[PDB]
Amino acid sequence: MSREEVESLIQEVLEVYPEKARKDRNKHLAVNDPSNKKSQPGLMTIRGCAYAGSKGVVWGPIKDMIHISHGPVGCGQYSRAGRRNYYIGTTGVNAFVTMNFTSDFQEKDIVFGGDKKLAKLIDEVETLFPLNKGISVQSECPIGLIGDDIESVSKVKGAELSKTIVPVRCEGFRGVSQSLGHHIANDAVRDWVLGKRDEDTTFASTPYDVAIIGDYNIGGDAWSSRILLEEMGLRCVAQWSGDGSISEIELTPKVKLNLVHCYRSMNYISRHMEEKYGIPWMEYNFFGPTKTIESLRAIAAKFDESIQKKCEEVIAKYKPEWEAVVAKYRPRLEGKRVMLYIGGLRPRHVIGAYEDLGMEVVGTGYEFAHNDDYDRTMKEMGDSTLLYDDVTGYEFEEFVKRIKPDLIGSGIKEKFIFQKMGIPFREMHSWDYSGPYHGFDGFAIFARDMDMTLNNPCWKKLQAPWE
C-alpha cells in the first residue's frame, strides 16, 4: 500500500462527515514523511477526561495515600480497579490502590456544596484508615461547576490533622482529554507534596541515585525496568506512580538523574525539578532488546566508568535470553503488519519491540498526544505509514478495512470490534491481562503474547464451511 493510496483512503473516509467535522478531521489524519484539539461532537472519540488522567493515571497508583473520587458515584466506580498499576501492599490497611473511596454526591451536595461533607469524610478516612500517609481529592465534573473550595478544606484539614491533603481540580470538563489531567496532577504534586523535604539534609544521597519518572507499573512493567537499572549499579530512589509511595515522591528531589519513560504524562514535573533542584532528565525506552540496550547505554554514559561497565555486563547477561525469544517467535511473526492506537506514549514507543520481532507498524495514532509527541513519532515510522490523531471509531474501522493489518493493538473499547472482523487483537493498555512488557523479561512475554494471538487457531475458524 502506497503514498497516494493512503491519501485517497483518507479522503474516502472523510466524505461521510458534515463539512465542519470533515475540515477538522482532515487536519488530524496524516501520511508519514520521516494535535491537542477538541473532539468533534458525536463522532465516538476513544478519549477519556481529565479525571482519568489525574486519578486514573497519576495519583491512583500511589500506594499508601487514599484518593477520593470527589463528586457523584460514576467516575470512581468505573475507574475502580480499571487500570493495572501494580503494587506491593496490604490493601485496606497500609495500601489502598484497588479501593474506591468516594464522596458519593447526592442532590443536597450539588445544591449546597460538598466542602462540609469532605471535611467529615476526611475525619472518617482518618478514624477508619489510620495507616494512610496522605489524602488526595480528585475533583469530578460538578466540584468546579458548583463553586466548592477544596483547597480551603485541604489546607484547614491538613493543618488540623498534620496530613498531606492534596486538592486536585481535574474535573472532566477541563481540557480536551486525559492529557490536561496529567498536567493538573503534576502541578498538584508540585504545589502540595514535592517540596516537603526541601530542607532535609538527612537523606544519604549517592552519585548513582535516579528516579523512574512516568512508569505506572502496568503488569509489573516498572519492576522489570528497575531490576535492570539496579543491576547496572544505579539506585532508584523513586518509582513515579507505579508501586509508588509518597515518601519516594518526597525524596525524588535528592536524586542525580530523572529517567523519563512517559514523556507525555510527566515532562511537566521533570522540567520543574530541573528548574528548581537542578536535576537533569532524559528520555528512555524499555520496549524490546534494541531500545532497552541503547537506553541502558545512554543512562550509563551519564555516570562514571564503573556504571558503564556494569551496563555492559547486564547487556551480556541478557543477550542469550532475549536472543532466544526471537529465534522462537521471530520466524512466527516476521513480515506481519501491525496497526496501533493507544494514548500518549506507547504508539511510538512500541515500534522498536515490534521490529525486533520482524514486524512492521503500518499505522499508529494517539488519543491525546501533543505535537512534540508527533515530532518524536515521525522518527520511528516508515514513509507512507498512516498517522491518526484522536481517531473516530468510524475512521478506524475504515482504515482497518483497507489496510487489513495482521494484528491490531489498541484498547478495551476497540478489542471486540476487530476480533469480530477476524483481526487478531492485543490490548496495548492493559497488556491484555498479561505482561510486564518492559525490559528484557517483558520482551519474552510480549513476544509470546503477540504470537499466541496472531497465530491462534481460532482466526481460521470465522467463516462457516457453508458460508
Partner: protein
C-alpha cells in the same frame, strides 16, 4: 530472568528471588512503610466488632460502592432499541467509562457517543454541542434513532435538552421526523437503575404521548414486558421463551440481547435486533404492561398507567419458584392462554432438583448484594431452598423496598437471622462477614477483595464468593447465564450446591487429616 520454554508472567515472575530481594530493598530503602506488626494489628482491628460500629457510623465517606450512576443505565436501555445510538450530552470521559465498563462485562462492543462538552460549554451551555453532535452522529453512524441522556456536567449547568433538540431540528441539523427521545439522567440522584427508568420513560413518552387519541387498550392482543436494567442475556431469552411456550403475544420493550451477542463471522455489526419504533408506537394497544423489575421502574409505571391506561399487575421479579409461578399465572390471566404442559414439567423438574439437593443447602448462611429487584428475588429463592440470607445489602435500595424484604423474611423461619441494609456498601459488608461469618457471599466481582480479606485472617474465616450479579469481570461468559424463571432457578441452585460441595472437597482434601470425609458420592 526468563527461561524461553517456560515464560513467566507477572505471577509468578516477581516471586523469583532476585525480584523478591529488589522489592524488599525498595521498601526498606524508600517507602517508609509501617512495620508489619503494626499492619497485622490494624488488620485484626479492622475485623472486630469495634471497627464495625465505627464503620457503620459513617455519614460522608463511601468506600467500595455497590451501584454506579444514572447514565450507565440510560445507555443500556437505549442499546435495547432497533438501530439506535445512545448519546450522552455532556462530558466525553463518562462515555469512555460507560463503554469500557459494559465492554468488560459482556466482552462485546458497546457503541455510544458523547457531544464532548468542554470548559466553554460550562459557561454558555451545550447548545452548539447538541446541534453538531446530533448531525455528526446521524451522518457518521447512521442510526435510525438517537437516544439522548446526560452527564452531571450538563445537569449542573441546567441544559434544557428539550429546547436544544428542538433547535437542532429547527436549524436543520437533523430532520424533523428523526427520533431523538431524551431523558435527564443526573449522577447525583439514585443510581444506574434510575437512569434506565428515566430513559425508558423518555422513549415511551416520545413515541406515544401525543398519539393517545387512537389507542384501544387490548386491540393488538399483546402483553408488553419491560425488563429494566438487565445484564444477563439468559434473562432476556428465558422470558421470551416462556411467553412463546404459552402462545402469548408479547412485546419485550428494549431488547439488547442480539446486539450484546453478535457472532464473530468476519464482520462487526454496530446495531442488531432490538425493539422496533413500531413496537413502541403500538405499545398502548396492548392488553397490559408487565414490569419485570418493578422497584426501579416507578416512573415507567406512572407513565404506563397514567397515559397508556394499563393496570400494571402487582408482580415481583420472576425469580425463584413462587414468583415464577405468579408471573405465569398472571400472564395466563391477562392473555387467556393456559400455562402449557412444558412449563408445568419444567417447574416440577426444578422442584425435583430442590428435593435432591436440600440436605447440602439446608441452613447455609449467605451474605449477598446487588440491585433491589435482583436482591429480593435471590432472598426469596434462598428461603425456598431452606438457606439463610443473613446479610442482605443493597446500596441503592430504598426504605419501602427494605420494608418489603423484611416482610418476606418475617414470613419464613429461614429469615430469622437476616438483616436488610440499604445505603450501605461493600466496606460495610466486609465488617459483617468478619463479625457474623456466613458460609458464602453471593455478589459481583468486587466481592473478590472481601474474600481476599477474609482469607488473610485465616482459612477458617475465608468466605468464598459465588459470582452472581453485575459486574462480573474476572470470569468469562457468565453474562450468558439465566437468573429468572425456572431455568434461572435451576442454574442458581446448581451453582449454590456445587459451591458448597467444592468448598467441602477442599476442606476434606487433607491426606490422612481430613480426607476421611472426602466422599466419592455426595
Amino acid at each position: 530472568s526468563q527461561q524461553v520454554d517456560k515464560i513467566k508472567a507477572s505471577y509468578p515472575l516477581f516471586l523469583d528471588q532476585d525480584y523478591k530481594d529488589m522489592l524488599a530493598k525498595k521498601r526498606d530503602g524508600f517507602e517508609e512503610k509501617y512495620p508489619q506488626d503494626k499492619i497485622d494489628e490494624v488488620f485484626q482491628w479492622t475485623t472486630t466488632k469495634e471497627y464495625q460500629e465505627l464503620n457503620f457510623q459513617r455519614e460522608a465517606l463511601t468506600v467500595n460502592p455497590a451501584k454506579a450512576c444514572q447514565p450507565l443505565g440510560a445507555v443500556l436501555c437505549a442499546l435495547g432499541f432497533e438501530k439506535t445510538m445512545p448519546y450522552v450530552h455532556g462530558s466525553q470521559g463518562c462515555v469512555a467509562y460507560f463503554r469500557s465498563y459494559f465492554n468488560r462485562h459482556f466482552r462485546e462492543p458497546v457503541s455510544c457517543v458523547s457531544d464532548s462538552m468542554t470548559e466553554d460549554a460550562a459557561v454558555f451551555g451545550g447548545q452548539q454541542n447538541m446541534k453538531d453532535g446530533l448531525q455528526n452522529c446521524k451522518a457518521t453512524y447512521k442510526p435510525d434513532m438517537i437516544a439522548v441522556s446526560t452527564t452531571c456536567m450538563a445537569e449542573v449547568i441546567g441544559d434544557d435538552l428539550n429546547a436544544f433538540i428542538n433547535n437542532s431540528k429547527k436549524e436543520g441539523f437533523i430532520p424533523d421526523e428523526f427520533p431523538v427521545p431524551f431523558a435527564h439522567t443526573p449522577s447525583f440522584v439514585g443510581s444506574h437503575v434510575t437512569g434506565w427508568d428515566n430513559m425508558f420513560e423518555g422513549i415511551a413518552r416520545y413515541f406515544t404521548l401525543k398519539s393517545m387519541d387512537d389507542k384501544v387498550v387490548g386491540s393488538n392482543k399483546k402483553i408488553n414486558i419491560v425488563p429494566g436494567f438487565e445484564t444477563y442475556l439468559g434473562n432476556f431469552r428465558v422470558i421470551k421463551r416462556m411467553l412463546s411456550e404459552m402462545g402469548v403475544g408479547y412485546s419485550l420493550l428494549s431488547d439488547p440481547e442480539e446486539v450484546l451477542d453478535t457472532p464473530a463471522d468476519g464482520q462487526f455489526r454496530m446495531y442488531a435486533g432490538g425493539t422496533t419504533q413500531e413496537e413502541m408506537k403500538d405499545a398502548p394497544n396492548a392488553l397490559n404492561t408487565v414490569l419485570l423489575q418493578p422497584w426501579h421502574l416507578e416512573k415507567t409505571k406512572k407513565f404506563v398507567e397514567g397515559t397508556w391506561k394499563h393496570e400494571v399487575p402487582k408482580l415481583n421479579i420472576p425469580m425463584g419458584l413462587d414468583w415464577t409461578d405468579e408471573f405465569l399465572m398472571k400472564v395466563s390471566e391477562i392473555s387467556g392462554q393456559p400455562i402449557p404442559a412444558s412449563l408445568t414439567k419444567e417447574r416440577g423438574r426444578l422442584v425435583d432438583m430442590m428435593t435432591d439437593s436440600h440436605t447440602w443447602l439446608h441452613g447455609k448462611r449467605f451474605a449477598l448484594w446487588g440491585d433491589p429487584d435482583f436482591v429480593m428475588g435471590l432472598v426469596k429463592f434462598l428461603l425456598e431452598l431452606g438457606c439463610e440470607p443473613v446479610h442482605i445489602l443493597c446500596h441503592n435500595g430504598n426504605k419501602r423496598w427494605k420494608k418489603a424484604v423484611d416482610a418476606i423474611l418475617a414470613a419464613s423461619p429461614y429469615g430469622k437471622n437476616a438483616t436488610v441494609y440499604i445505603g450501605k456498601d461493600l466496606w460495610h459488608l466486609r465488617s459483617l462477614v468478619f463479625t457474623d461469618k456466613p458460609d458464602f457471599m453471593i455478589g459481583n466481582s468486587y466481592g473478590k477483595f472481601i474474600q481476599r480479606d477474609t482469607l488473610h485472617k485465616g482459612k477458617e474465616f475465608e468466605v468464598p464468593l459465588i459470582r452472581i450479579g453485575f459486574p462480573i469481570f474476572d470470569r468469562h461468559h457468565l453474562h450468558r447465564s439465566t437468573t429468572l424463571g425456572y431455568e434461572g432457578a435451576m442454574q442458581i441452585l446448581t451453582t449454590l450446591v456445587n459451591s458448597i460441595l467444592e468448598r467441602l472437597d477442599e476442606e476434606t482434601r487433607g491426606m490422612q487429616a481430613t480426607d476421611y470425609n472426602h466422599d466419592l458420592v455426595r
